[PDB]
Amino acid sequence: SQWGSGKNLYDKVCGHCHKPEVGVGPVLEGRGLPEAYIKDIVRNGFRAMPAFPASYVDDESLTQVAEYLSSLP
Amino acid sequence: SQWGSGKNLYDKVCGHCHKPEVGVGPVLEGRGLPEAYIKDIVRNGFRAMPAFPASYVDDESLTQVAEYLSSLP
Amino acid sequence: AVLPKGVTQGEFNKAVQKFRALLGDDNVLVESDQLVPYNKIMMPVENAAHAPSAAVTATTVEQVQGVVKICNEHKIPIWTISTGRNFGYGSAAPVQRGQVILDLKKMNKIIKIDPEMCYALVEPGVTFGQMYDYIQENNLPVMLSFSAPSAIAGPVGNTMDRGVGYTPYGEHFMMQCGMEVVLANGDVYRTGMGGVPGSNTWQIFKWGYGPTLDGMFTQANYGICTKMGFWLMPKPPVFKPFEVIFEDEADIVEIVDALRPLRMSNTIPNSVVIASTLWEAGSAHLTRAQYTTEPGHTPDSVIKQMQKDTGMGAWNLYAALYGTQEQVDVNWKIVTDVFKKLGKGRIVTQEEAGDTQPFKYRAQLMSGVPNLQEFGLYNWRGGGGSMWFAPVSEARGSECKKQAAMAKRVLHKYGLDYVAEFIVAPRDMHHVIDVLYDRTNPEETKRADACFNELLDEFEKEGYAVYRVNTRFQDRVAQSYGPVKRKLEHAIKRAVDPNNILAPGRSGIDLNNDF
Amino acid sequence: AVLPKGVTQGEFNKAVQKFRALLGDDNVLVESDQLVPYNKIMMPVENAAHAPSAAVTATTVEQVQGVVKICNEHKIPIWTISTGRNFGYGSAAPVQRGQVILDLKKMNKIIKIDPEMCYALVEPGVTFGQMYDYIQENNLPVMLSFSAPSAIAGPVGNTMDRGVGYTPYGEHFMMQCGMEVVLANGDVYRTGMGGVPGSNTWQIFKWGYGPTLDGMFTQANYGICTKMGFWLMPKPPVFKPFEVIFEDEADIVEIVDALRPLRMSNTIPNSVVIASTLWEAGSAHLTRAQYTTEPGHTPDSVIKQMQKDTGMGAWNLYAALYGTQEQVDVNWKIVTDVFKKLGKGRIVTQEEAGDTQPFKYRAQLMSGVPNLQEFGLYNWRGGGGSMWFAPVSEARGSECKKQAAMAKRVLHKYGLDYVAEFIVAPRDMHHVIDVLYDRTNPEETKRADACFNELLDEFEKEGYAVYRVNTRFQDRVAQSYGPVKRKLEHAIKRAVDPNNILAPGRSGIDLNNDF
Numbered sequence A, B: 001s002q003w004g005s006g007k008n009l010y011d012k013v014c015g016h017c018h019k020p021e022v023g024v025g026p027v028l029e030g031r032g033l034p035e036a037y038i039k040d041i042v043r044n045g046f047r048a049m050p051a052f053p054a055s056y057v058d059d060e061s062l063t064q065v066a067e068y069l070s071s072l073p
Numbered sequence C, D: 001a002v003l004p005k006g007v008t009q010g011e012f013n014k015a016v017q018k019f020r021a022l023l024g025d026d027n028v029l030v031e032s033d034q035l036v037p038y039n040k041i042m043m044p045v046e047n048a049a050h051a052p053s054a055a056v057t058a059t060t061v062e063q064v065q066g067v068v069k070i071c072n073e074h075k076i077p078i079w080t081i082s083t084g085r086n087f088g089y090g091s092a093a094p095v096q097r098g099q100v101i102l103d104l105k106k107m108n109k110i111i112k113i114d115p116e117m118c119y120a121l122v123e124p125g126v127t128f129g130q131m132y133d134y135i136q137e138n139n140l141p142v143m144l145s146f147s148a149p150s151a152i153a154g155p156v157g158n159t160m161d162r163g164v165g166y167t168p169y170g171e172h173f174m175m176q177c178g179m180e181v182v183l184a185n186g187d188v189y190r191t192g193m194g195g196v197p198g199s200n201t202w203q204i205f206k207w208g209y210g211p212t213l214d215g216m217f218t219q220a221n222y223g224i225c226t227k228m229g230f231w232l233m234p235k236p237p238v239f240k241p242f243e244v245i246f247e248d249e250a251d252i253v254e255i256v257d258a259l260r261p262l263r264m265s266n267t268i269p270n271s272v273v274i275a276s277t278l279w280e281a282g283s284a285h286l287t288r289a290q291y292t293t294e295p296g297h298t299p300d301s302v303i304k305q306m307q308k309d310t311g312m313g314a315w316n317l318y319a320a321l322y323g324t325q326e327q328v329d330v331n332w333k334i335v336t337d338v339f340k341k342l343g344k345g346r347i348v349t350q351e352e353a354g355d356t357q358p359f360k361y362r363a364q365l366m367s368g369v370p371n372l373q374e375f376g377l378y379n380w381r382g383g384g385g386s387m388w389f390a391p392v393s394e395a396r397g398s399e400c401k402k403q404a405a406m407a408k409r410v411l412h413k414y415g416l417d418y419v420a421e422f423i424v425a426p427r428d429m430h431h432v433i434d435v436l437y438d439r440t441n442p443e444e445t446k447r448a449d450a451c452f453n454e455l456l457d458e459f460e461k462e463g464y465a466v467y468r469v470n471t472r473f474q475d476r477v478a479q480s481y482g483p484v485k486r487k488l489e490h491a492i493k494r495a496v497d498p499n500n501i502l503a504p505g506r507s508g509i510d511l512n513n514d515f
């Protein structure tokens, strides 16, 4: 695994903008967003949010982060 | 005149090695060295001493420095 | 579909076949769905204009040599990226429609971090985040220098574009020492001391012998950087960040002139950032929509109200002090007395603005700890439209007033804001302006493009030129520097890249030009 | 008589005719008696090997453009010099027999010295002496940086060879900002911001946009530098020079390792020079003949006696402190405590060694006031034989012991002395060795040439290469850096100089080579 765990990809990349204390992006923690949605936003990017290619964040790490996000309160 | 006076060429170039307090080169002050000799040493250089081309120290400034050196004690 | 300029479908297919045989199938990307994330741009133009034909991922130098060999055979234009986080400058997308992307993100090995000699030798894909973890895990007494993208960006790519940071090692190219490039002919060239067998001085002595060519490769297309070394600041025992808030907009003239001798004598060793209200606001995560919904720029009235509500000034300066407690206390007295003699601005310390933003992020940026807080600037108007317009001037206060009025006038004409900061270095001052707009709105997008062209025209007329710009305006900016420069640049290009495969168009260098 | 390689007497005569028509009669030198002062060399070879065919003196850029135009017509190899005081590196003499000397000594105008932005824009012929007078006359608060030749040497020539000084601005090429070069095709190229019409930033921002080429010209033959800008250090209110004398030769290992963090953190801002006994002796004007007349090297016995008589140590370190009284006093406490904790060496202040030499000259060199005292090194053995051998290493103490033993062993083998100094910069250590011999003695001359070759072979084997060398060994040193570098260098040379007129042979770059 490229980032090891889903918590790792979140702490190293996503959380820098998404963690509630930062606030550049909306909270993703425990919102139940589908994996297929999280994959399209990361691969296409969304307005202010940049896109990450597979070389940076692969499909497998995307599944892991999607699962880590759902499991939180 | 390129250096203006003979005292000037001495203070700006020659004296930096030749003034008694420095001592890289022997004392030239009041030794009565011929102008024709001072010209050949400057144009050829002499062992530890470098050579200065006409563009740096012209023939006329050489005559002036020769004359300034003789007139000192 | 999307094809390189001058390459036929059959010739492109032979090339993609050879790319697969060399790299594997999962390292060659030709489908729209896997190519789409490279296309994301904040430039006022449709994606189709900077759409790549393919994307290959190399992991070794031998593979890069293989890629250029194939590219020479079938005249395939290749655009090289490292971490590809060049937001406001083109992102990861090519300069021209149809080029293949050489993505070196996977070539991510930290080769050496010497904690005694204080240097690092890394590969293109290494991010500042990756480096920070390694430094924190292994307890190395070194400090890192970067800009806002920090965590997700990298040393190699930022330096190839001659980017800047906020620590005393903030001038990144000045701290670069040794690089390895693979030339268009497949040859591996090492700058400085790297060509000497058995040497341990590649990241120690910059120049080497003979012409020193590191600079020839930065902001150019004469080679693909595969390794790069740079110097790291030793971690000081004491770090002292501070802020000075200023109420009136006209104060900028006296601040810069008072700060210059302190910055030139190295009393304040890091680059002094003096941020405008809107920059300060976007970074503290305030949006325009929560203050006014009126069209056009943000009026002086609401900017004055934003200042009242938050306590932020017209100009907010951030700087830092490093060294031992004793040398910090002494430099603190010198900095304090200059601000007191001026009778303007209030000093805000680490004690007062504790865990408050924007102080917290700037303090982190000045001490090499990563955070992406400044990305709030893209939330000011939203929509994902952002271009950097950054001219250079003398670190003279009269230059602040001159350039600000010029910028503000052209920005307001097109309904955009003056979101800017001055980064004062010893002699040079950078006027970093973020022309932010809504890229989803086609009308605002067409005005942003027009605003950008006019900012270049207006500034060029008064003798100012930018030193880094987005891919769309790269050929235009090349013109600001004159014809002889362009003639010399194309002469070197013909010599090292006869087949014009190495990123044609980068910085206005393309063999299809008439120079 | 003496003619250029490949040029016939008639073709040379047409060229000299055109040189006269363009420049005048008194600006074209073809007679032996006026060409002889350019021929003076300290290299172990007869004058005939580096004898010029002619010598032209230009005063304007238009004349330089005229000279290269004529040189292209009749394939005349031109060797460019500024102040031409390159002692121990080839002096003013060509790299190859028969080249014409473009002497730009008369092009001596100080274009601008900004006392606020702290920069200087000068022409090739300007000397440091000329600059010091102008600074003292006009009461400018700037400081100058140079090496021993100081007064008689110049900023342009020293920087084109990437020379070094002794103040915090001692790395001269690092402080260079903006240059103008005339290319082989007659075009006038300006680096950085100089190509932008109406700009005032040429000596303010180094890089500009696109590839930054200042480095491409230094230690190369791709252009003739006609103007050069550089940064000047603002004069500090307090200057504090000091010396630390060390009795034992083995102390060098602990000194360097203790000094590195102080040098890396900028507590000691200037380059720390650690001089050996014989360097210290020659600079204090002591000769070998007043101690021993025995053949071969100077034995350890007499070096020990020289130390006893004068009070000079095995290693003598000189450094300086700059800033306000308060920051100097603080840095003084930090430097003092490091030497006390080491328990070695005695501190000598400006109070103790008042008007005594060698302290006085080093203190002057560290504060930008000119003196030629260090020329006494040529009086150590006399005869006018001197070559600089200077490899680079990490600023690590174990490297001092390693390189010293290697150098000392090869020098003694040929009957020559180990006259050297280490110049410690933040990460790089420079082992400057002056291989001094008697050039009037043909046997000692033949051994000096042999000694130099062996020093290159011995050091290259252990991974060390030199970064600057005399004209005679320039092609040899080019080999230490590898074939790819040489191939790239000749590729650029074919592109900017197709007719091979611009100093062929400089740094091993010549189109008659097979690369």
Ligand SMILES: *Cc1cc2c(cc1C)nc1c(=O)[nH]c(=O)nc-1n2C[C@@H](O)[C@@H](O)[C@@H](O)COP(=O)(O)OP(=O)(O)OC[C@H]1O[C@@H](n2cnc3c(N)ncnc32)[C@H](O)[C@@H]1O
Binding pocket: C080, C081, C082, C083, C084, C085, C086, C087, C088, C090, C091, C092, C104, C124, C147, C148, C149, C153, C154, C155, C156, C157, C158, C159, C160, C161, C162, C163, C164, C165, C223, C224, C225, C226, C374, C375, C377, C506
């Ligand atoms: C959004 C934002 C961006 C900022 C910023 C603040 C905000 C809020 N502040 C910046 C600042 O203060 N200083 C900067 O220098 N930049 C700032 N930026 C922009 C930022 O995204 C970039 O500076 C930087 O981090 C770019 O990203 P990067 O590090 O990923 O570099 P890259 O891979 O995109 O490469 C850049 C450029 O370099 C060329 N190229 C890359 N790699 C190579 C190799 N190996 N060989 C040859 N050419 C190479 C290429 O043209 C590429 O686009």
Ligand SMILES: *Cc1cc2c(cc1C)nc1c(=O)[nH]c(=O)nc-1n2C[C@@H](O)[C@@H](O)[C@@H](O)COP(=O)(O)OP(=O)(O)OC[C@H]1O[C@@H](n2cnc3c(N)ncnc32)[C@H](O)[C@@H]1O
Binding pocket: D080, D081, D082, D083, D084, D085, D086, D087, D088, D090, D091, D092, D104, D124, D147, D148, D149, D153, D154, D155, D156, D157, D158, D159, D160, D161, D162, D163, D164, D165, D223, D224, D225, D226, D374, D375, D376, D377, D506
């Ligand atoms: C004798 C002595 C010499 C020393 C020294 C101590 C002593 C006792 N200490 C030095 C030191 O610490 N640091 C140095 O860098 N050098 C020391 N030197 C040698 C010293 O003489 C030289 O460094 C330097 O001052 C050379 O003299 P210069 O300043 O006159 O330069 P130059 O005119 O000879 O030019 C040098 C070199 O550059 C090329 N060239 C010159 N000018 C141009 C232009 N305009 N365009 C293109 N190429 C140019 C050329 O190859 C020339 O030989």
Ligand code: HEC
Binding pocket: A009, A013, A014, A015, A016, A017, A018, A024, A025, A026, A028, A033, A037, A038, A041, A042, A046, A047, A048, A049, A050, A052, A057, A065, C372, C375, C382, C383
């Ligand atoms: C800052 C540079 C970001 C990083 C790193 C990541 N995201 Fe993000 N994300 C960011 C912003 C500014 C926004 C809002 C964009 C807008 O204009 O609306 C987002 C949004 C998302 C969403 C959509 C949320 C929603 O619809 O409620 C998702 C699913 C998302 N981001 C995911 C995501 C992941 C998985 C990331 C790590 C790989 C990641 N983001 C990083 C800013 C930033």
Ligand code: HEC
Binding pocket: B013, B014, B015, B016, B017, B018, B024, B025, B026, B028, B033, B037, B038, B041, B042, B046, B047, B048, B049, B050, B052, B057, B065, D372, D375, D382, D383
């Ligand atoms: C230091 C770099 C020097 C400068 C500048 C000048 N001179 Fe010199 N000179 C120097 C030395 C080291 C020596 C002795 C050389 C040796 O090997 O013995 C000299 C010698 C002379 C002499 C000969 C005197 C004698 O006693 O026979 C003359 C006439 C002379 N120098 C003249 C001279 C002039 C006119 C200079 C300025 C243009 C000048 N020197 C500069 C070292 C240096």
Ligand SMILES: [Cl-]
Binding pocket: C040, C041, C042, C043, C086, C087, C088, C089, C090, C091, C386
């Ligand atoms: Cl972009």
Ligand SMILES: [Cl-]
Binding pocket: D040, D041, D042, D043, D086, D087, D088, D089, D090, D091, D386, D470
């Ligand atoms: Cl010489």
